[PDB]
Amino acid sequence: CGLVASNLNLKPGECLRVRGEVAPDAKSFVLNLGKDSNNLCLHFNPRFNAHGDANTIVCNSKDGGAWGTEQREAVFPFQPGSVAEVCITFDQANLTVKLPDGYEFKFPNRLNLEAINYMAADGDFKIKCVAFD
Amino acid sequence: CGLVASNLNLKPGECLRVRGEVAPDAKSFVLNLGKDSNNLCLHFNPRFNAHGDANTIVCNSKDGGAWGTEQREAVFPFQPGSVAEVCITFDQANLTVKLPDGYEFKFPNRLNLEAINYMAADGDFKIKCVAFD
Ligand SMILES: CC(=O)N[C@@H]1[C@@H](O[C@@H]2O[C@H](CO)[C@H](O)[C@H](O)[C@H]2O)[C@H](O)[C@@H](CO)O[C@H]1O
Ligand SMILES: CC(=O)N[C@@H]1[C@@H](O[C@@H]2O[C@H](CO)[C@H](O)[C@H](O)[C@H]2O)[C@H](O)[C@@H](CO)O[C@H]1O
């Protein structure tokens, strides 16, 4: 696995910023946010070439070990072999993810945790920088 | 406890940059670095006024759960209610903690691990930014 951080205590409205290097031959990377590995309010999974998907952002929740209903975006502002920054915040209704080119999407908040306490990165994304606001 | 990060994979010569908020009423804060919570190549513990120490940095190791022998500095460049930045690196001989204004603290490398994989903050220190170089 990649970087795992806990005790984040990220409250509604606070910004979590992650900057990393996307591998030149990247097939996929993951940012998981929530309470723990079984309880994710956001599974954020850009798929360059994985699970039969191409240049597709896949998002989901995981609640008590169970994947929720998957959602995808049409836009894919990531390139292999470049640096990517992602900024995440949430309120009780939605997570809001802002992407490098100013792209911003919302994913329903299905878990309604009081805070994001857990983040894990995986796959072809080398984290260089994590910041809190 | 404060932020805990694992799978850091920080190798010799690589630089861990941490910026945090020292609480206004700070009595003590901690940065722990090593393999896991029981194997610390550096316990970095500025004590403003705790355990009978005043404005003293206490450093130690922990090896398979057992604390080593404490090393202490006279020089104390931390202030309560402020922002502190440190840059940490290690080699075969020492861990080095550097502050921007040029303070440099060295602690013997007692564990000789291949990497720092674990970092944890505790006490009156709120981490706001972590970077890898
Ligand atoms: C179990 C399985 O393979 N599920 C398939 C999906 O792949 C998983 O998607 C989740 C997020 O929803 C995680 O990314 C997990 O790592 C993936 O294996 C796949 O996206 C969909 C659509 O093809 O099919 C599921 O069955
Ligand atoms: C159990 C205990 O209090 N040990 C004393 C030391 O305090 C601990 O020191 C370690 C680092 O070596 C950690 O900072 C831990 O949090 C502290 O409780 C204390 O520094 C010395 C002398 O002042 O005595 C030890 O027995």
Q: Name the structure determination technique.
A: X-ray
Q: Which tokens hold the place of A99?
A: 């992407």
Asked if A57 and A38 count as a contact pair (C-beta separation under 8 A), the reply is no
What Cα–Cα distance (Å) separates residue A11 from each residue in A16, B26, B91? Answer: 10, 23, 37
Asked if B125 and B27 count as a contact pair (C-beta separation under 8 A), the reply is no
Which residue among A27, A43, A44, A51 is best mutated to probe the pocket of ligand 1, counting the most ligand atoms within 8 A of its Cβ?
Answer: A51
Which residue has the CA at smallest separation from atom 5 of ligand 2?
A: B51
* Ligand 1: nearest atom to the Cα of A67: 12
Q: How far out from the chain centre does Cα A132 lie?
A: 15
Beta-carbon contacts of B113 under 8 Å, excluding residues fewer than 6 positions away, are B34, B35, B39, B41
Q: What are phi and psi of B14, to 5 degrees?
A: -75, 155
Q: Which residues line ligand 2 (CB under 6 A)?
A: B 43, 45, 51-52, 58, 60, 67, 70
Dist CA B69 CA A1 (whole Å): 34
Domains of chain B: 1-133 (2.60.120.200)
What Cα–Cα distance (Å) separates residue A62 from each residue in A43, A93, B133? Answer: 8, 16, 32
Amino acid at A29: F
According to DSSP, residue A13 is labeled T
Beta-carbon contacts of B66 under 8 Å, excluding residues fewer than 6 positions away, are none
Q: Which tokens hold the place of A45?
A: 């999974």
Dist CA A60 CA B87 (whole Å): 36
Using CB atoms, pick whichever of B2, B129, B132 lies closest to residue A131.
B129
Asked if B39 and B113 count as a contact pair (C-beta separation under 8 A), the reply is yes
Amino acid at A132: F
Asked if A34 and A28 count as a contact pair (C-beta separation under 8 A), the reply is no
Beta-carbon contacts of B26 under 8 Å, excluding residues fewer than 6 positions away, are B48, B78, B80, B81, B123, B124, B125
Beta-carbon contacts of B126 under 8 Å, excluding residues fewer than 6 positions away, are B2, B20, B21, B23
What Cα–Cα distance (Å) separates residue B123 from each residue in A76, A91, B120? Answer: 41, 28, 10
* Residues pairing with B118 in the sheet: B6, B34
Dist CA B10 CA B117 (whole Å): 6
Identify which of A96, A48, A49, A98 has the alpha carbon closest to the alpha carbon of residue A76.
Answer: A48
Closest CA of chain B from A57, distance in Å: 25
Which residue has the CA at smallest separation from atom 3 of ligand 2?
A: B51
Dist CA B131 CA A3 (whole Å): 12
What Cα–Cα distance (Å) separates residue B18 from each residue in A31, A69, A114, B102, B110? Answer: 21, 37, 26, 15, 22
Resolution in Å, one decimal place: 1.9
Q: Which tokens hold the place of A119?
A: 């983040």
Using CB atoms, pick whichever of B2, B7, B131 lies closest to residue A1.
B7
